[PDB]
Amino acid sequence: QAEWRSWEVNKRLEYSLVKGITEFIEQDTEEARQQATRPIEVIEGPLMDGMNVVGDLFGEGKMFLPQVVKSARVMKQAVAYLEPFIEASKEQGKTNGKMVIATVKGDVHDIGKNIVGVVLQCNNYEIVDLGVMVPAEKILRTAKEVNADLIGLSGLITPSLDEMVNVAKEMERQGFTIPLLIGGATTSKAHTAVKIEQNYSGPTVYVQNASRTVGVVAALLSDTQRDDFVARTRKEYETVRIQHGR
Amino acid sequence: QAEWRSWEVNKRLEYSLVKGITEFIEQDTEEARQQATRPIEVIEGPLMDGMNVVGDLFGEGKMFLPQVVKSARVMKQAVAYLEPFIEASKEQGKTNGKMVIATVKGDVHDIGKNIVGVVLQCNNYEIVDLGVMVPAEKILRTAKEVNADLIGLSGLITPSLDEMVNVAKEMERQGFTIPLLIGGATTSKAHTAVKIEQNYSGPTVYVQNASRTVGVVAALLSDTQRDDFVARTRKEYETVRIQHGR
Numbered sequence: 080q081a082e083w084r085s086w087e088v089n090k091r092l093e094y095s096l097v098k099g100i101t102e103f104i105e106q107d108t109e110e111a112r113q114q115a116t117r118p119i120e121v122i123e124g125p126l127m128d129g130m131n132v133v134g135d136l137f138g139e140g141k142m143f144l145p146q147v148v149k150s151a152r153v154m155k156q157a158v159a160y161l162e163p164f165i166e167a168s169k170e171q172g173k174t175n176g177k178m179v180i181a182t183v184k185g186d187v188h189d190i191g192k193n194i195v196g197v198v199l200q201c202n203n204y205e206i207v208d209l210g211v212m213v214p215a216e217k218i219l220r221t222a223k224e225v226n227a228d229l230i231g232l233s234g235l236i237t238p239s240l241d242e243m244v245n246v247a248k249e250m251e252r253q254g255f256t257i258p259l260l261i262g263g264a265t266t267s268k269a270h271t272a273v274k275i276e277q278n279y280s281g282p283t284v285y286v287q288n289a290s291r292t293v294g295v296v297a298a299l300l301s302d303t304q305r306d307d308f309v310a311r312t313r314k315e316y317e318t319v320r321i322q323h324g325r
Numbered sequence: 326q327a328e329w330r331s332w333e334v335n336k337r338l339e340y341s342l343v344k345g346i347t348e349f350i351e352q353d354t355e356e357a358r359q360q361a362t363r364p365i366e367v368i369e370g371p372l373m374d375g376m377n378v379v380g381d382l383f384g385e386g387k388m389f390l391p392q393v394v395k396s397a398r399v400m401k402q403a404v405a406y407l408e409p410f411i412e413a414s415k416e417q418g419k420t421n422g423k424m425v426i427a428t429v430k431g432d433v434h435d436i437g438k439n440i441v442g443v444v445l446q447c448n449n450y451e452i453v454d455l456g457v458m459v460p461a462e463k464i465l466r467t468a469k470e471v472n473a474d475l476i477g478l479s480g481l482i483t484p485s486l487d488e489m490v491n492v493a494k495e496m497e498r499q500g501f502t503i504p505l506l507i508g509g510a511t512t513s514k515a516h517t518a519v520k521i522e523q524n525y526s527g528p529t530v531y532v533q534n535a536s537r538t539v540g541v542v543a544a545l546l547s548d549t550q551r552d553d554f555v556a557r558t559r560k561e562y563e564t565v566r567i568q569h570g571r
């Protein structure tokens with residue numbers, strides 16, 4: 080075995096990602112699977128780190144698109160393997176809610192819009208994923224028609240941030256009332272507080288990652304928790320504008 | 326059911342911090358130590374989570390200062406217990422660099438300025454911690470006298486942010502060139518890129534936490550990694566301003 084093939088499973092995952100090696104992903108993911116308490120952990124641990132580095136190497140031009148593209152296929156393959164180990168974890172239960180999630184317009188990144196989808200799914204919620212590059216009006220038309228309890232927007236490229244600010248305003252125009260969930264690698268609480276929220280009277284909660292989304296969605300949907308959380312949050316967003324020199 | 330004294334060690338930790346109980350902190354921390362790969366994990370895991378809760382309760386007026394102060398005593402007691410286990414963890418052989426770290430003016434929070442210090446130390450770096458509430462002038466004077474290869478500012482309250490921006494400016498005035506590291510609970514990369522960096526020609530890198538500081542200090546000091554890392558960083562902060570409507 081090549082020396083790399085002897086490193087720590089976690090260090091082997093990262094390598095595979097970077098290099099775009101699809102030959103050992105499954106057997107590596109599985110080994111990593113058995114060590115973690117929860118499948119989601121391998122995804123948000125090793126796998127994500129691996130994608131981070133890929134991100135960087137690409138950013139410093141030490142990596143190119145055709146390569147990040149091979150790295151994505153490996154990530155994709157790794158997630159795919161875990162997916163049933165996730166869905167086996169959801170006994171009984173019906174539905175706690177429903178969310179129309181979608182990668183904003185101009186953006187084709189979805190690897191994450193998906194992990195959050197698969198997670199909320201095995202948590203008993205219905206996720207109508209509109210896909211990548213979906214237009215604001217098609218976001219709302221579906222949110223209405225399906226009667227979603229929330230809407231999640233994913234965004235990874237700079238311009239996306241604006242499409243988010245935009246569907247926030249558009250939602251308000253149609254006088255929506257459902258909590259807006261924002262996320263995606265290039266999304267920060269700062270921007271969500273500073274540039275997104277203000278454009279909408281309903282809750283707009285920036286959530287950092289998939290596993291933490293379940294926590295918000297429950298709150299946003301709990302008759303007890305709702306009003307408090309939404310305030311705590313609104314007040315937290317009030318502070319950050321203060322700091323950024325409003 | 327019964328008393329806290331039967332819960333998960335991690336769950337017993339979080340409690341002790343909230344209530345300010347110092348009777349089982351060492352005994353408990355030890356149990357937590359034997360489960361983590363590295364001591365730093367408990368400090369950045371349970372302990373931090375407890376202190377987060379504490380902050381919150383204080384913020385919601387559900388907890389008062391004389392209580393957050395006792396919680397501090399416990400957190401402090403837990404770290405202390407851990408320190409030698411950290412020191413007995415690594416010593417390599419000699420100094421890699423030198424850093425003057427200090428908690429900004431009018432700020433007295435320091436439980437983190439220290440953890441980052443104790444981490445950096447066992448990794449073979451010399452740290453001259455100027456303490457809390459240190460004025461810009463004294464930071465620079467020491468930075469020069471001691472010929473530090475970096476400077477670290479810790480800040481946990483809103484006003485501190487401004488002092489950070491201030492010492493960035495002041496460093497530029499004395500035409501410094503060492504990299505400036507920003508950190509602290511109320512420190513964000515957004516504010517770091519939007520309001521701090523611009524004021525200084527040398528590197529201004531915001532590090533999320535102590536453990537991750539090692540990985541930056543190393544780059545900042547590597548002949549190889551240096552110019553790239555510093556460029557990737559700068560460019561990253563360039564984008565964040567752009568999203569922030571700048």
Ligand code: COB
Binds near residue numbers: 194232
């Ligand atoms: C698991 C997932 C891993 N993350 C990743 O999957 C993305 C990785 C990576 C390396 C980017 C680096 C990076 N910084 O991550 C880089 N890409 Co891409 C090179 N890219 C690709 C890949 C996408 C494939 C796919 N279908 O995903 C492509 C090769 C096609 C690709 C394409 C582009 N990419 C481009 C760019 C430059 C970038 N790419 C990035 C996003 C990045 C950040 C890299 C960089 N640094 O330069 C660039 C964006 C910079 C910017 N600020 O604009 C670009 C423009 C390149 C090009 N063609 O030249 C092009 C854009 C296409 C477009 N029209 O939009 C990839 C793979 C990447 O994490 P995540 O953060 O997305 O999800 C995470 C998760 C945790 O589970 O759930 C969360 N979440 C996310 N969505 C939601 C939520 C949470 C809630 C509550 C929601 C409601 C929604 C939370 O965010």
Ligand code: COB
Binds near residue numbers: 381483536
């Ligand atoms: C380990 C450490 C845990 N975090 C903690 O130790 C802080 C906990 C807590 C509960 C705060 C809540 C919170 N959100 O955390 C709250 N404090 Co205190 C109530 N407090 C105290 C405690 C501090 C004692 C001490 N010596 O530490 C005191 C009771 C004395 C205290 C005092 C104040 N506090 C006050 C306030 C309101 C707050 N306090 C906060 C900080 C906070 C955030 C909570 C809140 N929410 O209200 C308030 C500030 C909000 C704001 N935006 O201004 C205040 C004003 C209360 C008063 N007296 O009325 C007062 C300030 C007095 C002053 N002159 O500064 C405490 C304990 C807290 O994590 P950390 O993030 O600091 O370190 C972490 C670590 C990871 O390893 O390394 C990183 N790092 C940090 N520094 C650096 C780096 C990394 C690098 C690269 C660097 C160069 C530097 C990274 O940040």
